[model samples]
Target: KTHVQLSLPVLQVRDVLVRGFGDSVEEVLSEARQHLKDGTCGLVEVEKGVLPQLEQPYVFIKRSDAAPHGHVMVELVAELEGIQYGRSGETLGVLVPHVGEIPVAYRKVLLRK
Candidate 1:
């Protein structure tokens, strides 16, 4: 099976630091610490060759600074092939998003099974 890898855009995150004398007396500058100074953005594989148009519909953003590694926060912001247009931000979870935990069935859906 020839699997064609679809390249998607990866986003970079920075630390948001507020200026203050521990007193917020004067605002020096709003700084965003560039964490991804190295030349690499997070890459994910969306198989287009195997499945043709339908691949995984969501992207898992790793909350490295907040959570442990492999911890993910799922987001559905882009248009998927099988989804209706103008309907974004829909949760793929069995229940409301982040309600209880990652459902087992939901995990399977993410794998595109």
Candidate 2:
């Protein structure tokens, strides 16, 4: 399904079935989890086109202070060559399965690159 930005601004992450190996290996992730007891973490959307024009390099995670929901970070694991920084910290989507999360690249097409 396509990720339509919600009125509540819930961005849709892509499929949870693909990935690219990066510095965020499974062990590193596990360590972060143990350290961050109930806090959520993901490649937080630092920037997007939908918000109230806040500051640059700013990221928000909902319900974070008390009840934490973790987000998965996925890199550009596809065959696409280049990526464009359309907006400051804007990012793509990801889907987390019972096993793990998959990163999805946004605003990028093979031709656009």
Candidate 3:
């Protein structure tokens, strides 16, 4: 008889923002995970005190990993001016616009080669 071990995928999210250490950092990452579970994306706004040069510098989190129902990946997209906050006030995050269209084509092309 032989014994074998198997591993299954887990719902893991990454914090690419790389913000400084603190509970606030944990809060942000936790929130991002929530968004991933809810099937949504979001942004985080930083005050001027955090980064003066950044005019409303924000962190964007979206599912960048190409997987269905497992190994979720969240990452920052960009910092743009005049972006609206999510349904929740005071916090900012949004779905990656037009992401669905681009990845679909890329995956098909990569598989062909």
Highest TM-score among the candidates is held by which one?
3
TM-score of 1: 0.19
**lDDT tens per residue, model 3, 24-45:** 3344445444443453332223
TM-score of each: 0.19, 0.18, 0.23
Q: Estimate, for each residue in 24-62, the C-alpha lDDT of model 1 and write its tens digit.
A: 111111100011122111322333342232223322222
Across 1-113, the per-residue lDDT of candidate 2 in tens digits comes to: 22112111222233222122123334333432332233222232334542222212222222211111232221221111232222222134221211234333322211110
Residue 26 C-alpha lDDT in model 2: 43
Candidate 1 regions off by >4 Å?
A: 1-45, 48-51, 55-66, 80-113
Candidate 2: worst 10 consecutive residues by lDDT?
Answer: 60-69
The TM-score of predicted model 3 comes to: 0.23
Output the number of the lDDT-best candidate: 3
- The C-alpha local distance difference test score for the whole of candidate 1 amounts to 0.22
Compared with the true structure, model 2 gives a TM-score of 0.18
Ranking by lDDT: 3, 2, 1
